[PDB]
Structure formats: C-alpha cells, structure tokens
Write a protein that binds this ligand. Structure first.
Ligand SMILES: C[C@]12CCC(=O)C=C1CC[C@@H]1[C@@H]2CC[C@]2(C)C(=O)CC[C@@H]12
Ligand SMILES: C[C@]12CCC(=O)C=C1CC[C@@H]1[C@@H]2CC[C@]2(C)C(=O)CC[C@@H]12
Ligand SMILES: [Cl-]
Ligand SMILES: [Cl-]
Ligand SMILES: [Mg+2]
Lengths: 126, 128
C-alpha cells in the first residue's frame, strides 16, 4: 500500500485537483470498485460513471475552490484523513464549508473508499 | 441522550478534547460505550471495552505533560458520527513536540462513543 508519506502526497494532490476543477483527473484517482460516501451518512456511490457524475454535479460550475486547513494525517495501512475548506456560491451567496475527508488507498495507489464528514453545521455564509 | 444530532456531536467531540487536555481519564472512559472500540493509531489492532480503553488512556496520559486542542471545527454527520482535527503537545527528548491527529467517532443511541479511529503516524510528529 502507499506509505504514510505517499498518502500525504496523494491526498494533497486530490485537493489540488478539486481546487482547479479537473473532473477527469479526480475520477482517474479512484479504483474500479471505489465507493464515495459524501456526506458520510448517505448511501455510497459506486460505478465510475456515477462517481464522475457526482464530481460533475459538485464542481461543474467551475467556481468551487478548496484548500487544506491543516496537514494530512496518514496511517501505515494506506489510509489518511485531511481537513479542508471549500468555497462556493450558493444561490448567489458566497459560502464556505468545512470538511474532513477520510480515504483508503489500494495496492495500486488508487482511492478505494472516500468518506466526507460535513453537514450544515459546517456551512458559513460569507 | 438519544443518537446525537450534528450539533450534539460537535459538543460531545469538543468535550472529549477538553477531557484529554486536562487528563481526566475516568471521565474520558465514561464518554465511551461500555463495549466501545478504539483504533489508535488507525492501522493497529482495536481495543475492546472500557477496561482496555481505560488502560490505554492511563498509559498515554497518566504521565502528565500532554495537552490537546482542536485546530479547526468538528465536522459532524446526521447519523451520529463526526471527525475532528487537533494537535497534541507533549515532551520529546526533553523538549516540546507536537502531533497532528484526526479522530473519527461514531456515537450510540445513548450519546456514548461506540467507535473511535485516530489517524496519525510519525509523519505527523514535529518539533521546533
Ligand atoms: C464534493 C465536495 C468537494 C470535494 C470533496 O472532497 C468533498 C466535497 C463535499 C462537499 C461538497 C464539495 C463540492 C461543493 C459542494 C457540492 C457544495 O456546493 C455543497 C457541498 C459541497
Ligand atoms: C491517545 C492520544 C490522545 C487522545 C486522542 O484522541 C488521540 C491520541 C493519539 C496519539 C497519542 C495521544 C496521547 C499522547 C500520545 C500517547 C503520545 O505522547 C504519542 C502518541 C499520543
Ligand atoms: Cl490541523
Ligand atoms: Cl479546519
Ligand atoms: Mg450498547
């Protein structure tokens, strides 16, 4: 599995791709059988077309930004967790959302599971 | 308490950090369900139940000189779960060190911690 240091690089790369809005590059980071639970508590999304649609829905507008708010925490079993903040415009109102993503990577360095922790308690109207 | 709401999760997880910060081992243990699991660090074997959990916190905190504080807000779900970023300050080689950690928790229907996973490794340890 990816080492702790490699997990830190992969998870930071993911945020860089979200921030620029490269949907195809994000989807490429995922494994064939990957699941996305975003927000955690909702049913998992699976299937590569379905994951792509999820990111297109979320990032299609092109005006979403995302940045780490602290370092990636990484394990020795190919997993990690990171805190970040998303900036977006919601019905014309600039907003921010605080999020933590937890990821497990497979033996090939691809995301096998992603879980995004957030709810409206983490939303701030700027 | 029932299964905590998102707002209740934020309060519970923040109190947990306050209890770690002050070192009240018995109060930490009582926040956990009687049959809770802990994986700390995530990747290592889980430990089961309040007796084992108490031994774990006494071994980590009993020596004193550990402090802990949130580094950003608790992220909370609608299914009784949450995740939080924090930093632990302690002493290493006679000098301050710091460890960045994220804990993920799932609460039960009585407002007690059913599971906890702590994400960190030696890449998250730093010094002056
Ligand atoms: C998909 C996403 C970014 C990538 C990531 O890793 C985690 C999230 C979860 C919150 C999403 C966000 C994208 C922008 C969204 C759709 C909003 O405008 C409201 C909720 C928010
Ligand atoms: C148990 C603990 C606090 C409560 C919490 O929620 C997460 C952790 C994980 C890292 C522990 C820390 C306590 C202090 C420890 C023992 C050290 O001096 C090195 C590793 C670190
Ligand atoms: Cl942080
Ligand atoms: Cl944060
Ligand atoms: Mg029970």
């Amino acid at each position: 599995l990816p080492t702790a240091q490699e997990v830190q690089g992969l998870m930071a790369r993911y945020i860089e791709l979200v921030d620029v809005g490269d949907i195809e590059a994000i989807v490429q980071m995922y494994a064939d059988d990957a699941t996305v639970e975003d927000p955690f508590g909702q049913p998992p999304i699976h299937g590569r077309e379905q994951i792509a649609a999820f990111y297109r829905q979320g990032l299609g507008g092109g005006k979403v930004r995302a940045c780490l708010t602290g370092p990636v925490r990484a394990s020795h079993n190919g997993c990690g967790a990171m805190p970040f903040r998303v900036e977006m415009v919601w019905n014309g109102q600039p907003c921010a959302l605080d999020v933590i993503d937890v990821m497990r990577f497979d033996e090939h360095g691809r995301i096998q599971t992603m879980q995004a922790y957030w709810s409206e308690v983490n939303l701030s109207v700027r």
